[PDB]
From a paper:
Here, we demonstrate that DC3000 produces IAA and identify an indole-3-acetaldehyde dehydrogenase, AldA, that catalyzes the NAD-dependent formation of IAA from indole-3-acetaldehyde (IAAld). The AldA monomer adopts a canonical aldehyde dehydrogenase fold, which contains an NAD+-binding domain with a Rossmann-fold motif of a central β-sheet (β10-β9-β8-β11-β12) surrounded by α-helices, a mixed α/β domain with the catalytic cysteine residue (Cys302), and an oligomerization domain with a protruding β-sheet (β6-β7-β23). In each structure, two AldA monomers were in the asymmetric unit and packed to form a dimer, which then form a tetramer by crystallographic symmetry. Overall, the biochemical and structural data presented here indicate that in P. syringae strain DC3000 AldA functions as an IAAld dehydrogenase in IAA biosynthesis.
The x-ray crystal structures of AldA in the apoenzyme, NAD+ complex, and NAD+•IAA complex forms were determined. The α11-β14 loop (residues 297–305), which contains Cys302, is disordered in the apoenzyme structure and has average temperature factors ~1.8-fold higher than surrounding residues. Likewise, a ~50 amino acid region of the catalytic domain (residues 348–397; α13-β15-β16-α15-β17-β19) is disordered in the apoenzyme structure and displays elevated B-factors in ligand bound structures. In the reaction sequence catalyzed by AldA, substrate binding leads to conformational changes that order the active site for catalysis.
Numbering used by the authors:
A (entry chain A), D (entry chain A): 3 to 296, 306 to 347, 398 to 497
B (entry chain B), C (entry chain B): 3 to 293, 306 to 345, 406 to 497
Write the structure that this text describes.
Amino acid sequence: TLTRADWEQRAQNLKIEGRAFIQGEYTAAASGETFDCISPVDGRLLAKVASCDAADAQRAVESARSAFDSGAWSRLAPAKRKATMIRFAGLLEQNAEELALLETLDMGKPISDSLGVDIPGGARALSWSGEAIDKLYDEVAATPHDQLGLVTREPVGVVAAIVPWNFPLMMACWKLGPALSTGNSVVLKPSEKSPLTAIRIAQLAIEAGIPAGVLNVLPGYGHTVGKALALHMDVDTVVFTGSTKIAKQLMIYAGESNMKRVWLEAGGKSPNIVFADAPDLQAAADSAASAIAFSRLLVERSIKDRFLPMVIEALGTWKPGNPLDPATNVGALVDTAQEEIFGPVLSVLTFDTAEEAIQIANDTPYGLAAAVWTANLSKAHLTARALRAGSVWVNQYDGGDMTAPFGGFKQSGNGRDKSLHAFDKYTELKSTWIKL
Amino acid sequence: TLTRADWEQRAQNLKIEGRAFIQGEYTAAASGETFDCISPVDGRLLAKVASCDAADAQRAVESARSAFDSGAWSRLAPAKRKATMIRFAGLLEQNAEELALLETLDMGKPISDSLGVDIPGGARALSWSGEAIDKLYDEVAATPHDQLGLVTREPVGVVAAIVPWNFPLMMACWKLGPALSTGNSVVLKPSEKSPLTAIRIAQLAIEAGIPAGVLNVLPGYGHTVGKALALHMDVDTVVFTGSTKIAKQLMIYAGESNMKRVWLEAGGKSPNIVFADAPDLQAAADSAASASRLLVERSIKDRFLPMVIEALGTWKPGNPLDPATNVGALVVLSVLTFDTAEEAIQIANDTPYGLAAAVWTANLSKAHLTARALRAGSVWVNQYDGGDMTAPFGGFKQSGNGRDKSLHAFDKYTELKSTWIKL
Amino acid sequence: TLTRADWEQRAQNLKIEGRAFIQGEYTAAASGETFDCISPVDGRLLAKVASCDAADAQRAVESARSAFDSGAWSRLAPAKRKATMIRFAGLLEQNAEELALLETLDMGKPISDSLGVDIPGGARALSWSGEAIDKLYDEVAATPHDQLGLVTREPVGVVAAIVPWNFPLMMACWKLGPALSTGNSVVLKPSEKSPLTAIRIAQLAIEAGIPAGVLNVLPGYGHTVGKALALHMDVDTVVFTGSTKIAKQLMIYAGESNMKRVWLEAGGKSPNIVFADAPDLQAAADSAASASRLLVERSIKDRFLPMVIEALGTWKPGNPLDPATNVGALVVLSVLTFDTAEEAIQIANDTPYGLAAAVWTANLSKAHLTARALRAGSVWVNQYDGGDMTAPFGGFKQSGNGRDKSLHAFDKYTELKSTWIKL
Amino acid sequence: TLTRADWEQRAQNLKIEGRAFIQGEYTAAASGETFDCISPVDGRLLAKVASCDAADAQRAVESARSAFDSGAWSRLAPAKRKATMIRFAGLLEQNAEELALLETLDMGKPISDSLGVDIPGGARALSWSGEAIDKLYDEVAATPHDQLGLVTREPVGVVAAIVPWNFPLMMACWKLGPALSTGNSVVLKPSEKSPLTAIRIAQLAIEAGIPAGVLNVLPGYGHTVGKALALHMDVDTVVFTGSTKIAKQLMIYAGESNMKRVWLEAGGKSPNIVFADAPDLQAAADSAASAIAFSRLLVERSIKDRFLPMVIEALGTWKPGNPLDPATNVGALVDTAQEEIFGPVLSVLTFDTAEEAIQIANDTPYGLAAAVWTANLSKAHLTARALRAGSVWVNQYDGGDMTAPFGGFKQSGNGRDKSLHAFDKYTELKSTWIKL
């Protein structure tokens, strides 16, 4: 296992690619302009990264459209797209230490999380999506005997994927896995705060067998190249994760341009409901402490006095550190009777009944996730069912396989990352009704 | 079988309701204002219809939300929502002659179409969606043995349904069937050119057992009450059929308001692609004549175009109240030639739209490969305007997003939830 | 609401049909023989019922096969088979008082159960399966672009349905609903102890629009006409509910004849596992009393056993024609103690059978983990005899194979086909 | 590419395992008895193979039951069973040349078919089944609000898989893939004519991570150990491919013992319907010739004179040869107006209408497969639909991905190998109805 000094040496010895990627080749932005990618670990200059704009969006989309029309990927046999997507995931694992280090240097994530969670989780989304391709079935309708009615799914064509900086590679792979597996061409626009891993995997896709033009990567700013993609008249679908404010802007851009499909995932405050009969109060307390560090806590009154000190002590475990130290669990970054505030940073809502907890938890713009802690069978299922959240966790927190659609109710977003339902965002339904 | 004179007598003897419907009662608009519902058959004044605005949108949405939160419909057992939807459909059928006559007087559709197609088709959309409710299953994920992973569907809450004048009742039922069946409250906003059947069925829904506030109906103009629903901060989903220009405006209104989900069916074309080996050229000709772009293989064009010209002659405008009329009186077809299936596909797909297409060929490969290559939500092969309730209907590209009919229509009215339970 | 005297008057005034039904007509058995259908209520002779044998099996199967090959039902549009099945169910409901009375006279079931549970439950099985028909989709495989891969379901052809006397009509409808709805012809063989309702509904099927020959009914003995259907070389599938011993014999008969598919629901037990934290001990006690093995957690056993003894007293035998009767007059519960959920599971699973089980606990993990570990086709948690038409019913191990009710019941009556089309 | 001489040398240099495999170890039969596995290539003695009987069935089933009850495989997380099953497939590919050579020596299959079709096809069934495990979903019923209704699938427990000698490894993998992926323990009984590859992969399963006891292999005779498994009172399910006569016997054995589930796949004569408007008459003729060599031919009258000589010439291409020669396409083995017979070996039925063709093709005990050749859209779909066969091929022959359920109508069998439907044979449905 690598020490902090090993990672420091590896960091110094990286050669970091900063260019955009279009039609199988790294390329500067048409303007030649760049922005400084500055590490939050120690302020070092990681790379001068291409600052793409509308001219680059245009070239990336032309490349994407032409590749989609060629059929090189969009009409490739499903079992061969499966194999390619699994090789793609394998190349992420084969380059895991470099990718984890790029991620940590780019935006400060602890090297243990980059290497232990994000990069394997990104690989897993690519390979799971590939595995699923030829396990999917479309539909034959119940029709009279002189009719054959097919209901099939087809790729939308050109997909723009705009992702934030919190899980740069893993969020990108959650879009890329299903979007590529269904046969679309993808123009990926990583956050200006974390472009490096997206830039790096562009080349691994080619290595895996993804044809030129099928995955283009445009680093740069949201207000320049992101807006240009959202407004582009030949982009069929934009998928977005990020802030509610930008999510709303994309609907506006869609309406102002070509009525493209828009799928949104927008954070929102996620409640944590702890009942007095939770089976493992220490687990609930660890959960609550985790959410304050790298959420809205609701606690039953009969357990509040006992429970809050456990949250406080558990919070002590989270300590900033150098992200290059494997022991660090929080990145120490550098410049580039119902409601109470208990400590400096402990905000707590108290309830007496489950109905109170549900009404307070649902009193929100919503609503990406929620956790419920109770040993009682009826209260667990009825509370989970009453919460307006795309993900509800019961007696655990942040649980969820690749078999888990991740998304929100209302201003938290629309559509769902992950699962077989993830594919639906990237395909169109067609009805073929054949007279025999 | 009723004669024209029978229908003119029934038309004269109708009492026509014009009010909005909120929380189980017909009501004037808050302002007291109305607009004149004028028959394109006659010029006769059918009714003074409530001209709702933002204040009525507010009351309809508050009513819808409180009905949703009450669970009276949203948490009613699936089998009981099935029975109510089926009774609702039975009440359209039981009142079919009055509803077809309202439809024909309201916007000029021939009475034989209103009675024979639209009212039965709208009733069928309600009963079929009702029948489906308790046949749907959600999902149990494959998980480790100490986990239960459930992926379920839940109603979004309050649905605004905005529909045009071309198929007032049936297009409304295409929305209402799946939207109500999944437990939502619906605020229905019919076109200003055809509000009457939507107003009338609001009372039939109550008679069937739909609770007060679950189906509210707001007649009025698109730019007043329609805009106010698209912009409303407590409407979870808007579903729409109509023009591309308005469909785009709804996305903008959603972004300006609460990020509500927007499902659009916009304008589209139904091009016919007629190959020389079409099994029944007369059927292809009738299809082209019921209308726009006609793609014709060069070798049969000389023989085929006279067939469509003759068929175009069978459509005679007449009095919409005459059972013999097939086009209502009231108050250019482009020929492209091709030599290969590849050209026909490229020509057909050269469009911002993509709603439907019909393909005519007796060849196995050509039929399936051409249907695959067309960017249309519906492809009909060796027939036109085909499909029933099992066939989802909608558009690629700027013809909209989402699908009406089939089990997939339900998806637009529900939200996915993943519940991960540690055991 | 009818009184006992009302029911005794209706029982006296019935005219009871006793003939077999083949190709749209009631008929004597080929031999002319009958057996005496004696009421366990009274000893009264209800009817002299046709005693069919191998020759009648032959004629019923020839009729079924020719009806199947004609396509009159097997190739009728799914929506038309839906409407007929729903009308068929409506005819059971329209004749519910006569059918419940036949059921009660035939095998002694209390009239309030016959009228209140069995006839509605049988009708519901017919209408629910009918409603499902056109909501089912087959599959399009993921294939290269020059291939179309279809995986579809087709009716097996001729189905023999053999049912016992405990729920004559409803168990018959559990078979008929899915078997007819998928387009098969069915030869129904009711128990010799309860042939009357099956005989009677054969005419209702025709009245609903089921074609002649699609539903044939052969009363008689298991060892004559039943054996002859199990051994018949042109019966594609036999479905059965009854004893383990006969269920095993049917597999043998299938192997001795034409390798027909065999679907069995055999004997099973409904053990109750009552934990100390059960949310409602009285409900658990009533469950145990409606009866066999009772697993009880040691700490509540002293308090719980008096509750089941008291509840056992509420079951009083009486005249089956008395609406107040809950056990028909006509003509040992084993207590196991456990300390942990692991013992309770091991005790419960220590059985050759595995049809059903009920588990009583308010604990989330314990409920789900115990239900997972039980080898039973149905597990009820904090209720007993639960589930509706959406819940498949059947057994693990020697309680049989396959499931009645739910969309999965359809699988037993269809065959999969893969069609791989080169384009 | 290896020459015939390379294969001859490899054949001589093999060390061939002949023992049975129970509870993670090779073992002789309890009796110590063996039978001679004699190569049909040149009569050489390949190995003395354990001749298992009822005592061995009993020990294998006890091992299988105990392993299933332990949960080591049956309650292993689905994503981990996926990984193990994919490693299993990888070990087949890693040992492909040895496995292909064992198959060719064991029963005479051409070495090019063993190496090019059977071994990769067997690996593909194992890995596809593993890929599918965590893409499967059970069901949540539509219930009143105070009810949770689950409809789930569970492994049956102990599965006996009895396979013939025609595709010894590939047929075994068609059962093993889904049976193991769903978590059952499997007792595999290969044909007495081809036991070697089944014996050899038993060890590769352990290497892959399949726990001891989960896959036991019992070589020996049908009338001894096969019957003992079919009669065993603790086997939950027998799956069988082979002759109609033995298929019927297994139903009898099931009824005489414990009412175990029986799933059968029994050959039957498969028709080949050639219409005058077939798009590629040469392809249809190659198809018909292939079926006579390593079926029932139906030909439209208006094309018969033109078509039959193409069949005859195409049949000339199939020539027996030494199975160890890569050029060989047929193993040359050694001892261990409607109906016409045209040549020595060309039986042909002539029809005038599609209805005639359908009625003649369906006039059968059935009915495993069928092929239709016509360019006409309506006739293709309507004929395919009218045929009573588990597999219908249109304008091709023996087509079919792993996404293809393979099985028969009526005396051709019940249930279907391959596809997602393949899993249903190996699981039980349970309904859990929870009052809330």
